[PDB]
Design a protein around this nucleic acid. Sequence first.
DNA 1: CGCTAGTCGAC
DNA 2: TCGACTAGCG
Length: 348
Amino acid sequence: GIQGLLQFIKEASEPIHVRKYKGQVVAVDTYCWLHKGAIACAEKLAKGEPTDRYVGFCMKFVNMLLSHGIKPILVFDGCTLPSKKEVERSRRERRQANLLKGKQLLREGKVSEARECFTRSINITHAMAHKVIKAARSQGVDCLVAPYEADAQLAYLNKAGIVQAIITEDSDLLAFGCKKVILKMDQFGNGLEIDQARLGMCRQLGDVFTEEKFRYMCILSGCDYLSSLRGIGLAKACKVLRLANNPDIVKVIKKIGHYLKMNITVPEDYINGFIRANNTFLYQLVFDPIKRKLIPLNAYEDDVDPETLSYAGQYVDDSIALQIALGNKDINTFEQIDDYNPDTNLYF
DNA sequence: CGCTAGTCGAC
DNA sequence: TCGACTAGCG
Ligand code: NA
């Protein structure tokens, strides 16, 4: 998503061990463990052969967290945002290409090419994720499938005070306003923690350590919701937001030529895309597990009409969102593939 | 030379 | 493929 973010604010990082969060709750972006565990199963998953290695791989980290008296909440990605469905189609298409090519290379003889094609065509299905869910629930670990992107859901869990930290490899969590993010954690619990409050330890940020300005910077530098203007990265965006002190971000973006001491004419499409990206960071749908219902990541302000935020996620019935969050309902087909009932401690 | 982004290198 | 590294842009 946001390239070079970690290195840009590395001064706010600190090497920790997760035993720090003993007796507390930590949410997990399970996609990193799942992906790192599916790497080994590449050849065997490509051939459609039964695998459980990635399951035990995730259960390594889970049992590790449990051994240090930590309550982990495994969070999974859900439906793809309407604006990214085409990109998803492209990804699956390319993975299919490398899959078939991997088969042809398997028939030719070269095993290196075939396996390297298989590891570059890994498709984390929902069946695998559900296997991880069952394996985790058998150990008493709560699971949660996000309505859409897992990042937003995790960010909500942290903001709601449900969890104290987020384990992930995606630094984009910082743009979602996460307080504590644990990156690069190994199987033993050694990680690199970034705290929002420590953002001020980054001199190059200046006064851009507030959530809003930090978000603006991250978006302007280039994110998954909106590609940056040509020649604009973290340093340029940060400099622009430092030299400017106007709450109206749009007018600031329009005067991006002034702050960069040149002649820049910003397209209106990029402005609308910026508004949509910001609104997606702010109000993307997530699942409240306490009230058991769909809510925006942050409460709607006075200058936003919820009916115009279809790109940030579409509402469905709360019981449907519940069945999805439990992993009982398939994301794509909406078929009930499981009948787990939490009522028979995340869902009070 | 600061900085972005194309490309290297591990998976 | 994807994050890190640095060639080369401005
Ligand atoms: Na950029």
